[model samples]
Target: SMSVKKPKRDDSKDLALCSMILTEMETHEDAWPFLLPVNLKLVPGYKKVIKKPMDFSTIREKLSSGQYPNLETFALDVRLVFDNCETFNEDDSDIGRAGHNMRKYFEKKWTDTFK
Candidate 1:
């Protein structure tokens, strides 16, 4: 007797968890380099390399602005930060190590909270 429509998600509940996860990620040990957008002057050619250039502050703004209609899209942007880092940073560098750590922590927390 089930309809063809997908299961309805409690958006409020999902958004709440998203907010919590974001804050935890912000405070994480490896979160410093990712707190704000990368400094182009320091990186010199960052704009040419990583065009999207996502950061925690940007995600925070989008979430607060209600731009993310659902948690899945929200997670997409979160992963983007790491993906861009991997593209720009070498594995042995400090920033690259932080990206790996933060990505691991985030995926684990994401699974525990969402799955």
Candidate 2:
């Protein structure tokens, strides 16, 4: 018989890192152009009509409340936004670099905080 090991869960630290990332993204002007459009499109009421920028407050609130069950799901949500941006810009573009930087930021934060 083979034995299997389950992954350890670190909800608290994950939430903390995500919250930190959101806070950094909130005021990072380079992150806005990539984040705002995606945010507006995801909004239920404003997906088709809104023309203004959206803030990270909602995401921060959700993270603080433990709305995401795991780090994978949260990271997927972040990837989805950046992936959409990548569709229109090259990975070497400024917006693309912002996405890359955000990914690296979270990655380092996760490892540093958890390890």
Candidate 3:
């Protein structure tokens, strides 16, 4: 008799690898045509939330609270998306390579922006 295999649980190492791969691919010129349209679709909503003009009164109220709400939830949400990305599968070689290159590209951008 044979038993069925259970699905593997999420591992941090795997998530880290996926994150690295995602960062690398963003820098490759060859990856841009495919990457740009996706970025355009996803980034603008966040940008608008950050940059859209708002009344000074609202801004002041937010500042006065002294507690920036939403950061924790945002971080968790981002991680969940990263973990769930279909392109991050370990069994697919091409997907892994593309993910790695994208991650490197993104790391460069991240470093440039913050450092």
Candidate 4:
């Protein structure tokens, strides 16, 4: 079974990055094949760990259950997942290979942004 990992640090920046990656995937058709697997793997996991509902109406439900410490922690976990994809598998998985290709693409496109 897949268990969601909690973020060890701030998550807002990471969630924002994930959202950006998702938006990029949507806007750039060429990026779809590379990103689709990662996207599929991530969305469900994120939903499982997320504290906030897609809409605010369910906030009460979340509040009552205490499924999360807070939204910041949830976002951090998402960022951790994206950052840790390399640890998931570096060589064999099609999704991992795709991520490698996507990383190369990013490197080529934004040489200044290496992290």
Candidate 5:
């Protein structure tokens, strides 16, 4: 018989970061539009639908639910918002810099969860 170790999960940091991202998006007039055409590839169904508003509340609820079997999937869903945006790729612009910072924050928290 073989045994496997399960990775630890934490929703606190995820929720906090998500909340921050939502705040930035809501406050920054450009941020919401920049996040348009959200990448739902990581999402289960409705893959074709490009969520315009980037429903932060729904995502937050899902993260809180702990319904995802793997934490990585949840993280990916969060990353897709910034990763998919070309504007977010560039660090020169305001939104880009913010996106970069957000990504760093998310990655650090995600890594910490495993440790």
Candidate 6:
């Protein structure tokens, strides 16, 4: 059901850039952990550990819905996903590593997109 298509709105280059970043990040090899939001049962303590849990779908909607006023907020929410992930349990080594690698990946993509 996840077609992974870009939304039809690209009126702002900022939003369009956010769209591309989301596309690449979601399709990344290390995407599974951050692909969707964790369930309440699965990550019960996540509620307490992170100020807010961020994930692909959440950020996707926020961007495409025109909820983010600017790229700064959009980027912060993206970083928030990785930040919340850092506070997660230690069982998922891939998840932990993805946070590092993908964080760097996004920063590169971020720089290039704005360049």
Candidates arranged by TM-score, highest first: 1, 6, 2, 5, 4, 3
Task: Please write out the lDDT profile of model 6 over residues 1-115, one tens digit for every residue.
Answer: 4978676754457877789889999999988888888886776677667768889999998887889988889989989888887878353587798898889999999998775
Superposing every Cα of model 4 onto the true structure, what RMSD results? 12.6
- Alpha carbon lDDT of each predicted model: 0.93, 0.62, 0.39, 0.43, 0.54, 0.84
Q: What does candidate 4's lDDT look like per residue over 5-59, in tens digits?
A: 7655654454344344334433543344333233436566644543332311122
Candidate 5, poorest ten consecutive residues by summed lDDT: 46-55
Q: Once superposed on the true structure, which residue ranges of model 3 sit more than 4 Å away at CA?
A: 1-82, 85-88
Relative to the unseen true structure, what is the C-alpha lDDT of residue 35 in candidate 6, on a scale of 0 to 100?
84
Tell me the tens digit of each residue's lDDT in model 2 across 51-100: 33333554565577878787776666665555555555579888778877
Across 56-94, the per-residue lDDT of candidate 1 in tens digits comes to 999999999999988999999999999999998999999
- The Cα RMSD of model 1 versus the native structure comes to 2.2
Residue runs of model 1 more than 4 Å from their true location after superposition: 1-3
Cα RMSD to the true fold for all candidates: 2.2, 5.9, 15.1, 12.6, 7.5, 9.8
TM-score between model 2 and native: 0.56
**Highest lDDT scorer:** 1
Model 5 quality (TM-score): 0.48
Query: Clashes in each model (backbone N, CA, C under 3 Å)?
Result: 0, 0, 18, 2, 0, 0
Q: lDDT per residue, candidate 3, 40-61, as tens digits?
A: 2554453343332222233234
Instruction: List the candidate 6 regions with Cα displacement exceeding 4 Å.
Output: 1-11
Model 4 Cα displacement at 97 (Å)?
0.2
* TM-score to true structure, per model: 0.91, 0.56, 0.29, 0.31, 0.48, 0.83
Indicate the worst ten consecutive residues by lDDT in candidate 6: 5-14
What's model 1's lDDT at 25?
A: 98
